[PDB]
Every structure is written in C-alpha cells, then in structure tokens.
Amino acid sequence: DERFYAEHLMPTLQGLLDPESAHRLAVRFTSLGLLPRARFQDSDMLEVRVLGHKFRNPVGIAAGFDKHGEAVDGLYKMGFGFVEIGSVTPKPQEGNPRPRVFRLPEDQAVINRYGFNSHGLSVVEHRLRARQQKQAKLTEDGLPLGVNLGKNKTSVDAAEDYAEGVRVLGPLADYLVVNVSSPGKAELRRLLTKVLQERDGLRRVHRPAVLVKIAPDLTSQDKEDIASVVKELGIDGLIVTNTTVSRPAGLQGALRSETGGLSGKPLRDLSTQTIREMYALTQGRVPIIGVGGVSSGQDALEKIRAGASLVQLYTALTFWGPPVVGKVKRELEALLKEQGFGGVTDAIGADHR
Numbered sequence: 001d002e003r004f005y006a007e008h009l010m011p012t013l014q015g016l017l018d019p020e021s022a023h024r025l026a027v028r029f030t031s032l033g034l035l036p037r038a039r040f041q042d043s044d045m046l047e048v049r050v051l052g053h054k055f056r057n058p059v060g061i062a063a064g065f066d067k068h069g070e071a072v073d074g075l076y077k078m079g080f081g082f083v084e085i086g087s088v089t090p091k092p093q094e095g096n097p098r099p100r101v102f103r104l105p106e107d108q109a110v111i112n113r114y115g116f117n118s119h120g121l122s123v124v125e126h127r128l129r130a131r132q133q134k135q136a137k138l139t140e141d142g143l144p145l146g147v148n149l150g151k152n153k154t155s156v157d158a159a160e161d162y163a164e165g166v167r168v169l170g171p172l173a174d175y176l177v178v179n180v181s182s183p184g185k186a187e188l189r190r191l192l193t194k195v196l197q198e199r200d201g202l203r204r205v206h207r208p209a210v211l212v213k214i215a216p217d218l219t220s221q222d223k224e225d226i227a228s229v230v231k232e233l234g235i236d237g238l239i240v241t242n243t244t245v246s247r248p249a250g251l252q253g254a255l256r257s258e259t260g261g262l263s264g265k266p267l268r269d270l271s272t273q274t275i276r277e278m279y280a281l282t283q284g285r286v287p288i289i290g291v292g293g294v295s296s297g298q299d300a301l302e303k304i305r306a307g308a309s310l311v312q313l314y315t316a317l318t319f320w321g322p323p324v325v326g327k328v329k330r331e332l333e334a335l336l337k338e339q340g341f342g343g344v345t346d347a348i349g350a351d352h353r
C-alpha cells in the first residue's frame with residue numbers, strides 16, 4: 001500500500017540502513033518473491049509495440065537495480081512491463097570502495113558512484129540460462145528483458161568489451177544497451193559498427209535489438225553527432241538518460257557534493273528535455289526509452305509526449321517502494337484518458353505536433 005510504504009516502511013529503512021545495504025535487502029526480498037504480487041491489472045491502453053516486441057505496459061526498471069540478474073522474476077511480479085539488468089562487465093569487478101551510494105532525501109534524489117561493480121558476464125550468463133525458456137514465454141506474453149553492457153575499468157579496448165557482452169548475453173536478451181559518454185564521432189561510429197556486426201552474427205531467434213544509453217550532460221554538438229551516427233548505422237533505439245554529473249542549483253541534501261551520478265527528481269526535466277531533443281534530431285524514427293526522475297503518471301506522460309515510447313524508473317522505488325509501479329501506471333492511464341489519447345502509442349511524441 002501506497003501511504004504505508006511511503007510514510008512508514010521506506011522512512012524506517014532509510015533510518016536503519018545505509019543506501020547500499022537497503023538496496024541489497026531489496027534485491028534479496030524481490031528475488032525471494034517475498035513481496036506481495038502487484039494488484040494493478042494492466043489495461044490495453046498501456047500496451048506498446050516497439051523494438052520488435054510487445055510491452056504489456058510501458059514502465060520498466062532501469063539498469064542498476066538488478067546489476068547481476070538476480071531479481072528478474074520478482075521485478076515482473078512487482079508490475080514492471082520490462083526489466084533491464086546490468087550493467088554487466090566482461091570480467092567480475094568490485095567497483096569503488098564503500099560508501100559509494102548517498103541519499104538526498106530532501107531532494108528526492110540519490111548520488112551514486114558504484115563504478116560498475118559486476119559479477120561479470122559468465123556468472124550472469126548462467127543465471128539467465130537457468131530461466132531462459134521461462135523468459136522466452138514472458139517475452140512472448142509482453143514482458144521483455146534488456147541487458148545493459150559495460151566495460152571493465154582496466155580494459156584497453158572498450159569496443160571489444162562491448163563485443164564480448166553482445167556475444168555472451170545477446171543470445172539471452174531482447175535488447176542490449178551500450179552506454180556512451182561525451183568527451184569523437186568517428187570513434188563512436190567505429191564502436192557501434194563493431195557492436196552491430198557482433199549482434200548481426202547471432203542466430204535470428206537469439207538476435208537482440210541494440211540501444212545506446214546517453215547522459216544528460218552532452219553538449220549540443222555531441223547530441224547532433226549521436227543522432228547522426230544512430231541514424232546512419234540503424235541503431236534500434238536510445239535510452240535517455242543516465243544520471244547527471246551536474247548539480248542543479250537548489251539541491252539541499254547534505255551529501256550534494258559527493259562525486260557521482262545524480263538521479264531522481266532533480267534529473268527529471270533535464271532528462272525529458274534530452275528526450276525531446278533526441279526525438280527531434282532523429283525525426284521521431286528512433287525509439288526512445290525515457291528515464292530520469294519518474295515518480296508519477298505525469299512524469300511518465302511528459303516523457304512519452306516528448307518522444308519516449310517506454311519509460312524506466314529506479315530512484316523513485318527507493319523512496320516509495322513497490323507501490324510506485326502501480327501508482328505510475330494507474331496515473332498514466334488516467335491522464336491518457338483525460339487528454340484524449342487512445343493509448344500510450346497515440347501519445348508518443350505528441351508534443352512535437
């Protein structure tokens with residue numbers, strides 16, 4: 001229940017546990033199915049067909065919650081229309097020293113500097129294999145799986161790390177994600193060409209879509225360059241956005257000046273505006289998964305109207321708990337009807353017209 005979690009459980013956990021420990025508890029409870037199944041039965045208005053797949057609803061769990069593929073089934077039970085795991089790196093790596101995750105409760109925000117802690121591709125591969133046919137059925141039933149691919153800290157050849165990820169986890173995924181960072185266009189083209197070649201080499205029923213995930217912190221020129229390369233190469237979609245290294249004016253949390261990526265409410269509109277720009281630069285031809293500061297149906301609809309076909313959230317779950325998933329869905333449905341839309345699909349990019 002919505003007020004309970006929001007007003008009692010999540011504030012209690014906030015006071016008892018550091019954020020990373022609270023996250024690990026969440027992963028364990030979700031994976032053990034200890035959480036009651038979601039009440040909200042998805043309506044037809046929420047169904048989206050994009051990336052070669054049906055999505056029963058457009059609200060996904062963003063990368064970073066289930067870094068290692070431990071909680072996929074429990075995430076679907078929570079009501080998410082799709083799950084993205086990762087980021088997964090080729091070799092296991094520990095990530096940064098702890099503490100490396102900080103709450104900014106006053107801002108409805110988090111700052112993290114995990115540093116791509118990962119069990120690595122082989123461990124994750126075996127985890128996914130344990131439920132590969134279960135996932136095939138879930139995907140057919142409108143509940144797809146994405147895999148976000150990272151690179152190891154010490155790697156000398158980033159494109160090869162990504163290529164390894166494609167080869168190892170691509171066969172287990174409906175879509176793959178590669179994160180790109182600003183500080184060039186020829187290097188992005190080269191990387192993505194390699195990734196796409198590896199994807200194209202997989203057998204058809206094991207051949208995923210490939211998306212690029214971007215930061216909110218790109219220059220205008222960087223965005224132009226990404227739009228150009230993604231259209232040229234036929235990248236299947238964009239994930240817009242990762243966390244920000246900016247610190248918007250007005251942050252109140254004591255921990256605002258910690259190094260890392262900022263998520264949650266302070267990111268929201270910077271993300272929506274990035275979606276809007278990318279959608280325009282790509283002429284609406286490139287599906288966008290919109291991410292950053294979604295806590296309500298309004299938040300989701302703003303991203304859809306700006307050009308997102310699907311949305312994800314993470315940070316809101318850490319503040320409001322599982323009920324937030326059904327809240328966003330229910331509010332989105334209500335807003336679509338109020339604004340005269342037949343369904344999600346009809347609202348995609350509606351601001352641009």
Ligand SMILES: Cc1cc2nc3c(=O)[nH]c(=O)nc-3n(C[C@H](O)[C@H](O)[C@H](O)COP(=O)(O)O)c2cc1C
Binds near residue numbers: 114148213291292
């Ligand atoms: C604790 C934490 C860890 C994250 N780890 C990853 C990651 O491994 N890979 C990735 O692509 N994005 C990662 N992200 C970014 C999220 O996927 C998402 O892009 C961002 O947090 C904005 O959404 P939100 O405001 O709903 O959290 C992480 C975010 C948080 C809060």
Ligand SMILES: Cc1cc(Nc2cc(F)c(C(F)(F)F)c(F)c2)n2nc(C(F)(F)F)nc2n1
Binds near residue numbers: 011014025102110322
């Ligand atoms: C209070 C709190 C809660 C939490 N995640 C979380 C999220 C959850 F959904 C639950 C659940 F579902 F089990 F109830 C849970 F126990 C914990 N995180 N996750 C973080 C982190 F590290 F991801 F930022 N901080 C948190 N703080």
Ligand SMILES: O=C(O)c1cc(=O)[nH]c(=O)[nH]1
Binds near residue numbers: 087112115179242243
């Ligand atoms: O530090 C990480 O692992 C991580 C954090 C984040 O915000 N985004 C990401 O892509 N990785």
Ligand code: NA
Binds near residue numbers: 132133136
């Ligand atoms: Na299969």
Ligand code: NA
């Ligand atoms: Na198979």
